[PDB]
Amino acid sequence: ALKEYQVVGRKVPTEHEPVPKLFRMRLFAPNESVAKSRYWYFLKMINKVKKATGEIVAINEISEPKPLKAKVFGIWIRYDSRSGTHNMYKEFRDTTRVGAVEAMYADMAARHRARFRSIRILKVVEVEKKEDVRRNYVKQLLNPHLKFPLPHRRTKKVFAPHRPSTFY
């Protein structure tokens, strides 16, 4: 699965730069090693800081402060496509930022044939205001009187003696 990490890093201090600036990024990766490499290439492509002359100063996994409250997360991401450039913004209702990112990765691999390396996440933000929600299906979930029967009921022990119920 995925875990959210904060990676703080800087280049090695020298005489030219006695106090190098400290760069922190919030990013998602299965483990710390992938997170550090994910961060290093991001730092290379944004600020041209080489991996050799830099160092990861702080690694910290982050847990969801309120995993028991359903939230709506809007995700700004950039995609590499045939043209090599695209921008998308999706909304997912889930109780955890990590799960929202996992759902985003599954949806994009399902729709646009996107892989982990092809997807770079710009921002995952929480949308508390109902009006700020843009997606109609999210608004459908947010309606106060939501109700619906179970979808995809679908139901070793081969050779059942009776016919299936698949109803109530």
């Binding site: 106090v19 600036k21 760069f23 922190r24 944004i46 160092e55 100063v57 702080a58 921002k123």
Partner: peptide, 21 residues
């Protein structure tokens, strides 16, 4: 060259800044 030794990295002077790709 040996591996880099443990040291300190004071941030009160330069607090970490959020970077987004």
């Amino acid at each position: 060259a040996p591996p880099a030794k443990a040291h300190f990295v004071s941030t009160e002077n330069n607090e970490p800044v959020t970077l987004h790709p």
